[PDB]
C-alpha cells in the first residue's frame, strides 16, 4: 500500500488480489496476465493482473473493484485495453500517473479502438449505476462491425428471486449496517465474506438477472 509496504505483507496481497480476481471474474485458467509482485505498491505505472476478457460474457467489475477496495484501502483503477483481437482489463492498485496512450472513462456504451485506454472506477460506476438498493454494474464486451474495435456495454444487474436474495441478506444481518439506516452496504458484504466465504459463493452466484 505505499513503497515502504513488507514484502512479506506485499506477497499475501498480491496473492489474494489475484486469486480474487479469478475467482470474482470467473476467469479459465489461462486468462489471467499476472505482474511480478515484487512491482506491488510502488511504481504505480504497472498493473497487478491483466484479465483476458471474452466477447458476449456477463463481467462483474463493480463488485471487483470494491473488493480490491475493501483489501488494499486505495482508490483502485481497472483500464480496458484493446489489443487487437481481446480486451484486457489491466487492474492497478491505485491509478497510474502516466499511461502508454490516451485515456478517458466509461460511460453506459463504449467504443473501445487499439491504443486507447478506457478507464473505470467506482466513482463512475457510481455515476452510471440506477439508485435501486442492491445492483451491480456488470461489463460486456462486443464484436464491433469494424475491425480492431470492441464495444464495451455497462449493465445493472440484480438477483434471479428477490426471495432467494432477501433470505441470504438475513443470514448477512445476523453476523451484521454501515449504510444509511443500518442497511447493508457492499463494504459490509466484503468483511462478513471475509469470514463466511460460503456465503460469498450463495451472492454472486444470485446475482444473474440484467434489469430493465
Known sequence: ????????????????????????????????????????????????????????????????????????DHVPCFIFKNTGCAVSLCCFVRAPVKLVSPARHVGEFNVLKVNES?????????????SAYGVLTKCVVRKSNSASVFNI??????????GEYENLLRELYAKKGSGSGGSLTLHDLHDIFREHPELELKYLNMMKMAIT
Not at 472506477?121 to 440506477?130: A, Q, R, V
Not at 456495454?153 to 428477490?162: K, M, R, S, T
Open 1 to 72: 500500500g505505499s513503497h515502504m509496504a513488507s514484502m512479506e505483507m506485499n506477497k499475501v496481497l498480491h496473492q489474494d488480489l489475484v486469486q480474487a480476481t479469478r475467482r470474482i471474474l470467473k476467469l479459465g485458467p489461462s486468462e489471467l496476465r499476472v505482474t511480478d509482485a515484487g512491482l506491488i505498491c510502488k511504481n504505480p505505472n504497472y498493473s497487478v493482473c491483466d484479465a483476458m476478457l471474452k466477447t458476449d460474457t456477463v463481467y462483474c467489475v463493480e463488485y471487483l473493484l470494491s473488493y480490491w477496495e475493501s483489501r488494499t
Open 153 to 162: 456495454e455497462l449493465i445493472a444487474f440484480g438477483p434471479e428471486n428477490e
Open 118 to 130: 478506457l478507464i473505470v472506477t467506482l466513482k463512475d460506476i457510481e455515476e452510471i449505476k440506477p
